[PDB]
Amino acid sequence: ERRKDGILYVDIPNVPKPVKFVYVMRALGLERDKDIVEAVGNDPEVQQIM
Amino acid sequence: VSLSTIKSLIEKKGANLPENVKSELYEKLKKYNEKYKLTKAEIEAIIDDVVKEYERALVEPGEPVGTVAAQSIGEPSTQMTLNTFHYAGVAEINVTLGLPRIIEIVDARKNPSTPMMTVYLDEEHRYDRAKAEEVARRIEGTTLENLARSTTLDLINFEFIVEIDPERLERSGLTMEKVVKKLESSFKSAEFEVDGYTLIVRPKKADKISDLRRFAEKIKKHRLKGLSGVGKTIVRKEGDEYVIYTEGSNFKQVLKVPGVDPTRTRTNNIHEIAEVLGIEAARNAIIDEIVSTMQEQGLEVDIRHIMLVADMMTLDGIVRPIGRHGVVGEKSSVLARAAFEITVQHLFEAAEKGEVDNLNGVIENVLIGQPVPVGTGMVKLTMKLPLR
Amino acid sequence: EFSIFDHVLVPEHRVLSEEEKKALLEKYKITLAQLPQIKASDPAVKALGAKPGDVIEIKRKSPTAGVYYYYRVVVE
Amino acid sequence: MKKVIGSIEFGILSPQEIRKMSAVEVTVPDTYDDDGYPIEGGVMDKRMGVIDPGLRCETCGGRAGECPGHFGHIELARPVIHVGFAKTIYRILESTCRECGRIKLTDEEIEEYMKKIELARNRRSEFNEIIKEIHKKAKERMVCPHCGAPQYPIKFEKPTIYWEIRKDEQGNEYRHRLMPTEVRDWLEKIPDKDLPLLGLDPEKSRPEWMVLTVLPVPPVTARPSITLETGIRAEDDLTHKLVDIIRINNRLKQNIEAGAPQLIIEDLWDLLQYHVTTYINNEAPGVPPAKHKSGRPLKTLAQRLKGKEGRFRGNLSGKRVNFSARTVISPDPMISINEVGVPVEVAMELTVPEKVTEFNIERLRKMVLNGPDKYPGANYVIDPEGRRRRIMDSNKETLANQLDIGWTVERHLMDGDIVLFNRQPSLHRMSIMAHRVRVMPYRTFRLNLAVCPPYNADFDGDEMNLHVPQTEEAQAEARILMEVQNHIISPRYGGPIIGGIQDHISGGYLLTREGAYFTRDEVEQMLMFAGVDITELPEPDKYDENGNPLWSGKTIFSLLLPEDLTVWYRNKLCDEPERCEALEKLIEEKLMPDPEEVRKLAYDGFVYIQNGKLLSGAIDKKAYGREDGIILDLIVREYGVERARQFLDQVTKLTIWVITHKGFTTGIDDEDLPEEARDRIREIIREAEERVNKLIEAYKRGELEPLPGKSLEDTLESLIMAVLAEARDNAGAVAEKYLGMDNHTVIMAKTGARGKILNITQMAALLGQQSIRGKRLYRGFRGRVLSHFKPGDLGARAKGFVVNSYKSGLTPQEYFFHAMGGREGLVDTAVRTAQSGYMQRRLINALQDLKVEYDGTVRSPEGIIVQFKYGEDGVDPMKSWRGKTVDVDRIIVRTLLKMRG
Amino acid sequence: FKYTRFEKARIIGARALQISMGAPVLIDVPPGITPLEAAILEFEKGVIPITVIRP
Ligand SMILES: [Mg+2]
Ligand SMILES: [Zn+2]
Ligand SMILES: [Zn+2]
């Protein structure tokens, strides 16, 4: 989900509460900020959003 | 027979009749006398017939008016349409119709789904389209989006050039310098390099796309001229004068706008009417709303049932929902309330308060096994025993 | 300058005196607590000099009978 | 000797009342005993009442089934806090001084609050608000205005534990637990005058009685042992809880009398309190639910009442009532409107009890001689003492010679008996009415056709229920209050609701149509069929070519109307207003023109009746239709109900006869149009499509003005829909123009008997735009509805506009669009029923208590006056003409004509 | 004074119950009719002993 503030969240069924998106990507071994940005595309506005 | 004689005879014989009945009788008797030369005997016979008919038409004690009114309201609704329409008119404002509207009025929701105000005009501005448009501008609640012919939201280089149409500007009565002056007087922390027929904005050197997007949308829908919470206005011409229909709900503010006739002005939101004009006005507005909603669907319902419902709703100064939230939920009969709840604390509260159940209802008497005090359950009989 | 009583939706209001109040109360065999109530914050009350515990006579304009009298009591 | 409970006032029992009301002091926790006998001093004593068979009650001396049971009491060792009153007790403690016990409030505040309470007594919500306000004001105070003593804060711990936060000599706050004895001592000192402000009545609920000192024991009937399939006496949960209560009470008492330490006394006190709380309410907050012997929560007093199927909410229900039947219905107009046909088999089961008297002894004797097999027979006979016997065949010959005054015979249904008739769902008042029985063969509830509208019934498998009242009072109520005759005028809008529907209108038009004449044979036959009492034909009007006499339909119809009826109005067939204007001019000029002049000016669009003679006009829906039945309304409101019933029962049969023997049909050629009309429709459609394409092009090239209410696309859609609707209306107008009145379908539409002009338009000329939720069809593939259109197309043909009528046949895409429209209609029909039902239920629950008092006022169930002079004029909506109290115009005209004639 | 239809219904019910219980009929009636139409005819003739009390 994307909240009204522009911050992304992930809702895992077991986890009682949503997690921030970058935390979830880093838990999966994708730690680089550059790589995290690259994994979702290259459109500059999207890059600025992330 | 001089008209004074007819009036005197009416007052002499039909003194029991209501005022409207005797007035209408006088009018039509005058017309028929001037057309057919009636004598006094016919007038006396006519008045006696009217009195007898009125006496026959009176309701008898013990009639269960409440159940009859409830049924006569509920039954037509089953034949009435069930929303799921989008009436797209040109000189009209979308308004919830039919069953949803009836439910909203009956449950007295705080804010209607489609608030709408009817604004009349004083004598000066009533008989001209241009003065009506002027009052509209006073009440238009004009927004930059409506003024703009089109908008270009180009975030790629941090600017926002919105194209303003001259015709909408002329209709609103505002000029580019005027609107820019108002905007800067409101948006102090901004720089407006207005050029030609385009507005140019900058968010005090913002950094991220989202910030400028939010700032641009903040300006786009920002109000320039007009009372709060008012959208489009459709000035029509009904009868002979021009009447200003309007969206939104600012019933107390609009009454102070010059050129607005406050006596005839009405609004959809009944709660606002209760706040501004009082509770009797709220009752009358409820009656009129239900009548109009029934009429637009072609159904016919007697005014008396709606009057009873409205009187029952506004029984204690404040308009309350007729359902279990405001009327049923406060039933005095603890037995009647008992078979509507999930807890037993109401029994303890009633016992503490020493509440007395008068058994004046229906459910409690039915549960006990006693005649309901309506209709034939009201009468008492006596007889003189010596019989032939 | 604009008074609420000039609006078509607002019928005329009046304040009853003690004698007529008691005559009305005796006519229907009722007490003060059994009448409909109008809050002290109602604009019609403010336009008048009404005080709590008083009975307001309302002269409705009825679609069926033309003139019709309704009564309310003032509470907090 | 039989009185009626007029009111029930609730209060709080006092310990003295519980002591004297009860009979046996239960002390020993004794069960049913091995031999199933009540043990003395046990929970089920004989003074409590007996449910076990073969023994007598100790108190009343009644055998099981006739002893109502009796109450017993338990003497508690220590005070116990009632769970329900715990919050009330806590609120009271925070409002009264610890020393004096009076309300911590100033006298002026007391006076003001007393006045406000006296004013707002009836309104429960406002009373609670005032109580809460006073409670807050008193609790916020710290120094008693009377004593000046400090009031240490009282803390409430759920469910029944109270802590007094006191300050030691060092200022530290420590929680002092208030034992129930302390609470009782606090509560006793509260004076009576302070109770009304505190929210109490000092005659039925005193605060000291909230803390229980004596616990009453319900009688054995109230806690019966239902036993088990194995024969084990499965006890009541209340019985087990009472046993535990008795055990713990005896234990606490014996340890108290033994000088036990304070800790063990406190332990037993808390055990007693917990057991009492779980016995009163096993689901009280903060209370562990006591487990049954099987480990399930025990059903206790609270659970026994707050059940949907319990005493509350459960007694009101719908079950199989006695003496009822249900079967499909079939039509027949040969019976009166207030009659119903009953199958023989049903009539031989739904017996009605009749007491034999002197004037009906022989009829009942014959009936009981018939036995329970011949139709005019009986099934049960009751002797004056009270025994019931079945007639059968063994003692059929007797029970008749020994039948005299004072017996009761349960005879079969016979003609003339009163019977209710119901159709579910029952929406308005007219869904139940009383009919007269007429036993006929086969198995269907025959119903007259004029009675269909109020029931809202169609003969396509609909079923109906009938109930047979048994007692004389119920029969009289049904006969006088509920008969079909009295309910002709609908209470809703004040007009008729019973009248002709389909043939009664079309056949009436055929009979009264201009230029319709009947021969002597037809006249006599139809008059005899209608039941009209006649014995000489009127003078013939016009002679046939070969010499036979003829009669116009207008005179035949006039033979039914009363002798002094006079009325005139405009019907639905008025298409040339000039003729109506001329007729109105003449009538208004004279008020009684010579009937010869009217004949030359006759016009079937203008009904005019003079002294019961139909002079001009034709019969249509406005005569005696479902609504706006001018003539039927006039008959009802001026000649009594019986005359109206006779008139309806005659006109129905007359019209049915004329339509049956005159021929009425409809074929495939009823919607055949001439070539010119087809060309006109085609060119209209083509022009509309061209305009729509022009609009689309203008939108595409940016030439569009968006009105403020809509964007560009929404404005485009609005314009398209308006254009298409206007085109459909124009096509319908053309089709209606080219369709003559002699067409049977056009007759049915115009007279209002059945169908609308839109139906003819759709069947002949054009079907029109199809919409979902008021919008053009849009839900489909990406940018197109179907797959056979180019994507991004907004043309009329591609978004639900169908150009083929039903006669021409629809192309597959048009068929799919029509299917979408029909599906939407069906869904709306399905949902609106539930929504309307919910709203009606709410309204009825709110308003079902109001009634008209004997002085004309309408009073709420709690005594508040809702409306003086109900309706602000006192006129019943049924008795009102059409909303107006008195139609003085009709009164003036009728009186003037009657006296000037 | 005019009988409301509820009053008439109650009067008819009471009279029919009394006639069924064994009370004599104040007017001659055709044979083979139930108590109900007997009471209805009694009311129609205007011969009614029972009266109503109004507050
Ligand atoms: Mg059906
Ligand atoms: Zn007993
Ligand atoms: Zn004190």
CSV table of C-alpha atoms in Angstrom, one decimal, chain E residues 1-2 4-5 9 17-19 22 33 40 42:
chain,number,residue,atom,x,y,z
E,1,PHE,CA,-74.7,10.4,20.0
E,2,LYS,CA,-73.4,8.0,17.3
E,4,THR,CA,-68.3,4.2,16.6
E,5,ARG,CA,-67.7,1.1,14.7
E,9,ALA,CA,-68.4,-4.5,17.1
E,17,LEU,CA,-72.0,-14.4,23.4
E,18,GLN,CA,-75.0,-13.9,25.7
E,19,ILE,CA,-77.4,-15.4,23.1
E,22,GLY,CA,-78.6,-19.2,26.7
E,33,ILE,CA,-79.3,-19.3,12.0
E,40,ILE,CA,-76.9,-8.6,13.9
E,42,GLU,CA,-81.2,-7.5,16.9
